[PDB]
């Protein structure tokens, strides 16, 4: 059930603050999101296709 609290008013602090956050873990693991934000260093020119090419060795 619930405890000993019987106030009519909506809790002034939201729940994620008033209480701990119950989480549940699934047995088989979970995939991290793909990206944690948009910060990134980028590697360009990695590959090919296009230059002063095919004078270039085989």
């Amino acid at each position: 059930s619930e405890g000993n609290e019987g106030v009519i008013i909506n809790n002034f602090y939201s729940n994620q603050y008033q209480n701990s956050i119950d989480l549940s873990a699934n047995a088989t693991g979970s995939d991290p999101p793909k990206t944690y934000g948009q910060f990134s260093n980028l590697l360009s020119g990695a590959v090919n296709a296009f230059s002063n090419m095919l004078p270039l060795l085989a």
Partner: protein, 231 residues
């Protein structure tokens, strides 16, 4: 635009049991998943129903009573006062649970497990006597109140329920002082017929005694018993 307030006289008090919450200082904290967990209960009533052992022969307590090969109508095998304070119940979960509340209501269940030989035979008279005229002094007087006859045979135990008979809707859990000739009556156990046996068999047997709450049983108003030390 600042809002006007009237400060109540009780400004600044702290109430140990306030129906409200306080200031959170470390929000957004996720917990460690505990979802694999089992065995949880949510109401004490959920487990108050499990029988635990009554202590006989206090303070040299044993979890049983002994039936003999003689039926003296004048001699009870046991006499329990129906009080959640009986020194008899002092260590049952019922009593340990109950001591944290002010009042109770409902059925009490006394369970007897016969532990003698399969070859033994016998009959017991278990009675509940409401208060008013004192405790019964012979099986003949007990037999005048609520009672059951327990016959020994294939089935090992007997569950006796003492009916809640009371003027008030609830009864106080604990005693202030000691409760006289009062309390709420008595559970007395008597032999109707003696334990009988064949040659080659012991002439007395132990009967395990336990107590539990009935489906009826209720408790209300949480408090704290007088503090004690187990030693």
């Amino acid at each position: 635009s600042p809002i006007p307030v009237t400060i109540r006289e009780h400004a600044g008090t702290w109430y140990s049991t306030l129906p409200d919450s306080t200031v959170p200082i470390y929000g957004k904290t996720p917990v460690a998943p505990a979802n694999y967990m089992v065995g949880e209960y949510k109401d004490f009533l959920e487990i108050a129903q499990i029988p635990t052992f009554i202590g006989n022969k206090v303070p040299n307590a044993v979890p049983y009573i002994e039936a003999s090969n003689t039926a003296v109508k004048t001699q009870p095998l046991a006499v329990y006062q129906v009080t959640l304070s009986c020194s008899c119940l002092a260590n049952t979960f019922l009593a340990a649970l109950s001591r944290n509340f002010a009042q109770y209501r409902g059925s009490l269940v006394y369970t007897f497990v016969f532990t003698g030989t399969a070859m033994m035979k016998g009959k017991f008279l278990i009675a509940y006597t409401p208060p008013g005229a004192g405790k019964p002094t012979s099986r003949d007087q007990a037999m005048q109140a609520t009672y059951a006859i327990w016959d020994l045979g294939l089935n090992s135990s007997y569950s006796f329920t003492v009916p809640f008979i009371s003027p008030t809707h609830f009864r106080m859990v604990g005693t202030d002082q000691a409760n006289i000739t009062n309390v709420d009556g008595w559970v007395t156990v008597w032999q109707l017929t003696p334990l009988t046996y064949p040659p080659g068999c012991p002439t007395s047997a132990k009967i395990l005694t336990m107590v539990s709450a009935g489906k009826d049983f209720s408790l209300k108003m949480p408090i704290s018993p007088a503090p004690w030390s187990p030693q």
